[model samples]
Target: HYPRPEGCSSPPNAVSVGLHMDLYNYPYLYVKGQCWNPEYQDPNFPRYGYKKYGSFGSSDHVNGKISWDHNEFKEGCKPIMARLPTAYNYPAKITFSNFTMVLSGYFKPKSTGLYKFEIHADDFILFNFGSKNAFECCNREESIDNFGPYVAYAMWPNEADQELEVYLFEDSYYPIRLFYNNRDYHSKFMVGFYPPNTEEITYDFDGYLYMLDDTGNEC
Candidate 1:
């Protein structure tokens, strides 16, 4: 039944439902990886000389291996679950080509129209589906779209995968936020969902990210 009766919730103090994007499944998302140390730049961190970095990770394949190609898991992202359309590859000291990642979750949609969301990345991406937005998961939560703050996609395609449609809010669980900071390439970031009647098609934050790092950046 997943929401069969006259059943329906979310809209009345609803914000990221059941929180962290509906019922923690598929690798329970929260991925972070960073290091741009210009020695943290000049004489210290903040924005030091405009460039510098350092951050961190774990495993369950880092969160059940998900990808767009970075060779399919060596390093980059992690997890409570993901047998989920998994693909990821990194850990040649794990790098971030123009890197940045934030993927929040929620989507228990079985049927609903206007769902098409396919975004394969090469450089620059900001997508908020089911809204509420983020960076700690990135930031924006107006109750994750009681009907939207709906769709937002900042672009720079540079190459591959671009299809976005959002009018989802049918039977249940819907809250998501994703922002992968531009890049160099190889282990790209992804999101694929085409929902409506059935014939289901879906995905979110698979991995493949690299072109150059370990101190050399190119994409």
Candidate 2:
């Protein structure tokens, strides 16, 4: 078991949460997070603004299908990518409650060592409403660490609803990625079979952010 970082009880000014999906079976639905930006364009499709944040397969192979689970089905399932908002234009100083976010992706680390994953909310809140709650489904909740110069409170697998304020210096951009062993990628269809020479795959998210308030109301 990974060791928990210090100050596990303190709340963080911003939080980043994610889930890793392992699809080694068959074709599954892919969902990408929605962006509030109207001017944002799909990174793969430049001419058209993306209606949703996630896409199937790579930019060159959006329609390429492969089997999600078995090598035999590789030709039908597609790669998944995540969608993030270009900007969070919520009046900079707004205090958001019931702040919930999720990151879903595929990983197949090739080796075993200490891997670092970072998440940034820039200026957002991550709290639970209705009752005291904590982050669930984490592999090693105590081993997670939170670090930031602008942090107000930081905790993982949060057990209660907390509030955070957006600051002027806080960049709207949030980053979340993983570091694992190359061995994790060695398994057959662990990360999904794309093509013979495919190097990377995309993960999809559907409406990553959910807003709740101190009054136990979700927006």
Candidate 3:
């Protein structure tokens, strides 16, 4: 329920916003823009902090999602909630006659196992452009391999004739320690698209998307 600062600018050319949940702040958390500052660094952030996660700046031009995790805090520390800074801004609100976008992220597996991701979009009309697995990481350093130069694993066309809600669900179950002990596991959804307009405007909308557990509740 946090609000953006006055006179803040939006991310360049951003259409829809995605909020990565702070798994530690489950159920009562507020959404903010992606973290661009160099100060706050916590590994769990991408898992829990979408704004703090993802790729931004010049690199984003070459590759839409080209950022890395910034979390460096020791595991088990209480998660910190960041207030939207006045300098924060979203690029633009995208209106789609046809909904088409891609969600992406960097993943590192602690152990060899299966991981799942579930996605869901509600109310708004959307169309599935399809999913892509650009790279894989089986070890720590290896995680950084293919760290740059992102390529799509799948592609689809914008079919405006068949508009529908674009909701996705992924459940990544890896033996890796993506989560701290007793802490909820968090996954980020990096959605990409071209907005109908490129003009910057005041961002006055919810900047996050949440997933529901099997019980029909936001997890």
Candidate 4:
């Protein structure tokens, strides 16, 4: 078996296990056709000053159901929950759609080697390593509509699963942020990682992940 990371104790900035989770609900419901359609646009649409054609190309497709900007869902959106410390994995299923969730924290590598990060999702998901920039979602632009170099993302009917491979040192902690959004229908997501040469993927987050405490102490 591979050796666990050295100095496994919480970092000086870590307060507890798990990451910071924030859920923001889209302010408007799905329009009959599309939110950006002048004739069918929702009057309450935030019109966050940016418009992008559906990334999936057609409205009938996953993310194409609405002409949306990356920032639209967050403009004046209601927070379902903010800064809640939780595991990397989300509930298996959710009742609502058209919401975005962000998970931010630090991840500790059990052993030094190449790791494969994988995500199972229904709508969309992204990962930003060593930084808390979920709003950017793997892209340098803040108002992009197309998919960036996400660690793992799933749009259904189009893309099934995506994964990223990176080499990490044992005992080292890396800052991480995950961005996910469900436009319609069902919603669920899970994040897993495969250690070097391991056939099994690990989903356990406790003790390996952490968020800053209310007092701002990471440990």
Candidate maximizing lDDT: 4
Q: Using Cα atoms with residue i matched to residue i, what is each candidate's TM-score against the true structure? A: 0.26, 0.18, 0.18, 0.55
Candidate 2 per-residue lDDT over residues 1-219, each given as its tens digit: 532222111122322323321111111233132222212112321112221334322111111121122122222223322221222212222101111122222122222222232222222222211111222112222211221222222222241123222111111112211111101111111112122233443222222212111221211
Show model 2 residue runs off by greater than 4 Å: 1-100, 104-108, 125-219
Model with the higher TM-score, candidate 1 or 3: 1
lDDT tens digits, residue span 41-114, model 4 = 23222122112322211110011011122322333212222211123234333223455555555566678787
Which tens-of-lDDT digit does each residue in 1-219 have in candidate 1?
122211123432332222121111112124443422122122221112212233343212222224343434444333111222323323333344334444444444545555566777654344654323221111223232222232444444344456766555455444455544433323466666666653566553232111111111100
Count clashes in each candidate, considering only residues at least 3 apart in sequence or on different chains.
33, 45, 38, 6
Per-residue CA lDDT of model 3 for 1-219, tens digit only, reads 211111111222422232121121122122233222222124333333423323232101112231112233342223333222221222422211111122222222222222222212211111112112222322222231222221111111132112112222232211111111112112112223211222332222122221111221111
Off by over 4 Å in 4: 1-15, 27-95, 131-149, 212-219
- Rank candidates, lDDT, best first: 4, 1, 3, 2
Candidate with maximal TM-score: 4
TM-score of 1: 0.26
- Candidate 1 — which residues are off by over 4 angstroms? 1-11, 16-97, 103-111, 124-159, 162-171, 177-179, 184-219
Provide the overall lDDT of each model, using Cα atoms, as 2-decimal numbers.
0.37, 0.21, 0.21, 0.46
Task: In candidate 4, list every pair of residues with a backbone clash.
Answer: 13-218, 13-219, 14-218, 14-219, 15-218, 15-219
Q: State which candidate, 2 or 3, has the greater TM-score.
A: 3
Worst 10 residues of 4 by lDDT: 57-66
